[PDB]
C-alpha cells in the first residue's frame, strides 16, 4: 500500500551469548511495525515482556517484511489488545471489521484513543487472528458486513450517498 499503517515484520533471532553449555533458544515475535526502527524496539520490549533478556543477549538474525497475501478484502480482524488508561494496561479482545492489517492498526489506534483512553506511550497488542465471515461476534459494524457478503445485502447497505440524487 501507500504510506504504511504497520506492516508486520517477522523478526527473528538468537541469543548468542556466553561460554556456557546454555544459549537461549530459538524465537519469534512477529510484530507490527513501520520498518527497522520499530523492529528493533519491539524486539527489546518483547524481550522485556515474556522472555527477560538484555539488549545484548537478544541477537537479531534476519528480517522479512509484509505486503498483502490473501486479498485486500475482507478479514474483519479479531485483535487481542491491551490499552493503558488511568493506571496500567487492561485486557481486550476486539473484533472489528477491517480491510486489512494495514488499516487494523489505525482502526484500533482510533478505538484505544477515542474510546478507551490512549495517548502516547503505548504499544500495541498481542495477536491478530483471522476468522470466517459468518463467525464474527461483537458486533455492530461487522454484522452488517457479514450480511453484505451474504448478499441481498450488499443491495442493502448500498445506502450511503443516497439522499443526494433524485432518480
Amino acid at each position: 500500500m501507500g504510506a504504511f499503517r504497520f506492516h508486520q515484520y517477522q523478526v527473528v533471532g538468537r541469543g548468542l551469548p556466553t561460554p556456557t553449555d546454555e544459549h537461549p533458544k530459538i524465537y519469534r515475535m512477529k510484530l507490527w511495525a513501520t520498518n527497522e526502527v520499530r523492529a528493533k524496539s519491539k524486539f527489546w520490549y518483547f524481550l522485556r515482556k515474556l522472555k527477560k533478556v538484555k539488549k545484548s543477549n537478544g541477537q537479531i538474525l534476519a528480517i522479512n517484511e509484509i505486503f498483502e497475501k490473501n486479498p485486500t478484502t475482507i478479514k474483519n480482524y479479531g485483535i487481542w489488545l491491551r490499552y493503558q488508561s488511568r493506571t496500567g494496561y487492561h485486557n481486550m479482545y476486539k473484533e472489528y471489521r477491517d480491510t486489512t492489517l494495514n488499516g487494523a492498526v489505525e482502526q484500533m489506534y482510533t478505538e484505544m484513543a477515542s474510546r478507551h483512553r490512549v495517548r502516547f506511550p503505548c504499544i500495541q497488542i498481542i495477536k491478530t487472528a483471522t476468522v470466517h465471515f459468518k463467525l464474527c461476534k461483537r458486533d455492530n459494524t461487522k454484522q452488517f458486513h457479514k450480511s453484505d457478503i451474504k448478499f441481498p445485502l450488499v443491495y442493502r447497505k448500498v445506502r450511503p450517498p443516497t439522499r443526494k440524487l433524485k432518480t
Binding site: 508486520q8 517477522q10 533471532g13 538468537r14 530459538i26 524465537y27 538474525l61 534476519a62
Partner: protein
C-alpha cells in the same frame, strides 16, 4: 554476499516466520558495522559530566 548463504540454505525460513511464532535451527549471521555519530541536541540543560 552474507545474505546469500541464508538464502541458499533455507526454503523453510520465510513462510513459517510470516505466518506464526518459533524459529528454525541450522544457521545465523553475525554482523559488524562501524558507526557515524552526530549531536542533535544542544548544551542547555545537561551536566558537565
Amino acid at each position: 554476499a552474507y545474505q546469500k548463504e541464508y538464502e541458499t540454505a533455507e526454503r523453510n525460513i520465510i513462510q513459517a516466520k510470516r505466518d506464526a511464532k518459533a524459529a528454525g535451527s541450522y544457521y545465523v549471521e553475525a554482523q559488524h558495522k562501524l558507526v557515524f555519530v552526530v549531536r542533535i541536541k544542544g548544551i542547555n540543560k545537561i551536566p558537565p559530566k
